[PDB]
Design a protein around this ligand. Structure first.
Ligand SMILES: [Mg+2]
Ligand SMILES: [Mg+2]
Lengths: 101, 313, 314
RNA sequence: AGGCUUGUAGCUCAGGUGGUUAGAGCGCACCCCUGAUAAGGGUGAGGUCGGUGGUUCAAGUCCACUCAGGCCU
């Protein structure tokens, strides 16, 4: 098997994935999504509303776009970063599937 | 002379109310909140326990376990109370204290799992209860139990056919488990022999997994506000060879139609109820669906969702 | 072939269910929670609008004012939304955000009166509105409108008689306005001619104003938390000639029996629903009532009372 | 005059055998956070690939000639 080197996009897509997990996939964000999926509020400090569903649609678009970049590659640093993207999506979808039914 | 022996037998026989101000008077609304726990799920909380008693697995001594965070937990709680059985509902810690008061005052044993795992932590906990003593606990599995679409083939199928006198041309129902869409389409297309029925499913646009399954695509689930539908996967009760069309509904136009369906009609309707009516409005914008009688399932009431964002101020 | 033309035509035909674990098993509960606004009031919230259309006073162009915050405010809200009228409910300012959000959702103009007054302030502003433009507003007056006991003679009375097949011996119903007790007792004692029916009335012990009127004493009300019954006076719809017994249910006995009616028999019951079953249990302590078909009305659902004292569990 | 070489988003730049159209860093707009600033994170906008022709199933990439800069001359 011929090992390859990264583009400037694949090495961007690795650093986007690892920073999306350590800042947007906290346990607070999966709580606040499920609070928002059936309506009951998590308010702001003095008014307004924190929209956790829009911030998880953004996280799911990010982790799916940045895993499609790193999908058919052959660098072991980029196949290992693909594993964190697929496992982070499976962490989200296992919290969402069959909810409210 | 009909005295009911318990409240689980009082399911069904719900009105088919014509909508006079949402649409052109052809949309017929089947109010499914006229049930003993005020959801469409009351039909399946009765028949899944009826079926378990017929095939001998539900004896005196056998308890009931099912992971749920919706109207199925209310529907299993009154039938286990009416028939006289025990129930344990596993669910995340996210849901409200006012939802847990309705289940605990109705005779359920709530097991609250940690909310960061979501429903899989609520699902996988229900197997450690069953694997503790498998001869004692029963798992109902609403997404794969064939008693879920069979209550709709026996009850809510013939109710639509006898109210419309066989004139229903389009049937529209949202799909959370798929027993309602499959059972009605089995009675009208299969038993009564009307192949021309158009069975339209309703899904969220933020999780359009039925349209991705029909188009051969990878499954793309996501969070949505239309509670009741949008499972994130294709369940075993949904038969995709009967789904003739699928219409996606955004979260703001589902909440907008439910507020119309209260204010202009007097029907207390949840978000999934307004999502299914708005699919009938999107379908009637086509000019071939203007002399068609449309039957729309309205699965829940709005009073249950009264602390939510359906009621703004 | 039955397609209902609006949601208000779907009242009635509520099932009569046997209570197997409460009593000896001859209590027959009629669950009035399965009406289109989930109360007993849907029947009178529809008939009083149907009667006003036929009297010629509810034309296209006239309003509806009713000093009412409870179940019959919800019942007038969905019928006026189903049939196209405009509703203005007058009620005190000390009411919950939650019930006000259910009434704006059905399209009801809510006018808020002073909280130091209470209910008699809500009545007085309703007659201030009708006195402004008498041709354009309209009261309904559920305590004195004869369409309140008329619909129970046309719907509730037959549904008890044709489901029991003529075997109802005792009829327990709570009296808040005295329509469901009057209408069914006029059907069975009057039309079908069964004078042996024992029509009893459930009242609070803190406000026993029906027992003070039958004993010839001064009517003195009091506060209670069996909401739905106990108006504090004898309404004009309640005729005392039909009432045989009067049973006073204590406020903790209604909470305990409604919880007992949910967890043992699967019926979502409010506080007044538990008060009416508790009167059936007090009546079965006599051996003369243990072979009687007790028929009891369950007027509301416990999911509406979900923030009240009925749910003291975490 | 010859042999070469630079030209890709507002700036500096990668672009592997001719295959996602075309991508990164800084900067612009929005969102989380910092009482606030910096630091740090995410999403989006921005492209006659110098110009014109040829070839190929397909050209930013391969050729032919020009336009502007640097090298010995
Ligand atoms: Mg966060
Ligand atoms: Mg440049």
């Amino acid at each position: 098997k011929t090992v390859d080197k990264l583009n400037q996009k694949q090495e961007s897509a690795i650093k986007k994935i690892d920073n999306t997990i350590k800042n947007a996939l906290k346990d607070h964000d999966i709580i606040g999504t499920l609070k928002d999926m059936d309506g009951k509020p998590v308010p702001k400090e003095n008014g307004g509303y924190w929209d956790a569903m829009q911030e998880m649609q953004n996280t799911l678009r990010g982790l799916r776009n940045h895993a499609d970049t790193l999908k058919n590659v052959n660098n072991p640093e980029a196949q290992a970063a693909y594993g964190r993207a697929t496992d982070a999506i499976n962490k989200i979808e296992s919290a969402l599937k069959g909810y409210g039914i | 002379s009909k005295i009911f022996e318990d409240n689980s037998l009082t399911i069904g026989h719900t009105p088919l109310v014509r909508l006079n101000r949402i649409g052109n008077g052809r949309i017929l609304a089947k109010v499914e909140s006229r049930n003993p726990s005020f959801s469409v799920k009351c039909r399946i909380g009765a028949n899944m326990i009826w079926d378990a008693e017929k095939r001998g697995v539900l004896k005196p001594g056998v308890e009931l376990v099912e992971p749920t965070s919706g109207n199925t937990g209310i529907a299993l709680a009154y039938v286990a109370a009416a028939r006289g059985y025990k129930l344990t509902l596993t669910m995340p810690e996210t849901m409200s204290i006012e939802r847990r008061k309705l289940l605990k005052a109705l005779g359920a044993n709530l097991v609250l799992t940690e909310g960061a795992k979501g429903m899989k932590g609520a699902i996988q906990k229900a197997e450690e209860i069953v694997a503790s003593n498998p001869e004692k606990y029963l798992l109902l599995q609403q997404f794969s139990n064939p008693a879920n679409p069979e209550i709709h083939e026996k009850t809510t199928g013939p109710e639509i056919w006898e109210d419309t006198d066989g004139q229903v041309d389009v049937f529209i129902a949202g799909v959370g488990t798929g027993g309602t869409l499959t059972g009605v389409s089995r009675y009208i297309k299969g038993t009564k022999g009307k192949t021309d029925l158009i069975s339209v499913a309703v899904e969220p646009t933020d999780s359009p997994v039925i349209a991705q399954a029909l188009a051969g695509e990878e499954i793309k689930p996501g969070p949505h506000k239309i509670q009741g539908i949008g499972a994130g996967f294709i369940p075993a009760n949904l038969d995709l060879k009967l789904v003739d069309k699928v219409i996606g509904i955004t979260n703001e136009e589902a909440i907008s139609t439910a507020r119309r369906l209260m204010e202009e009609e007097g029907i207390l309707a949840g978000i999934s109820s307004g999502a299914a009516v708005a699919a009938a409005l999107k379908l009637q914008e086509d000019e071939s669906f203007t002399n068609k009688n449309i039957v729309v399932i309205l699965p829940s009431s709005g009073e249950r969702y009264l602390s939510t964002a359906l009621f703004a101020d």
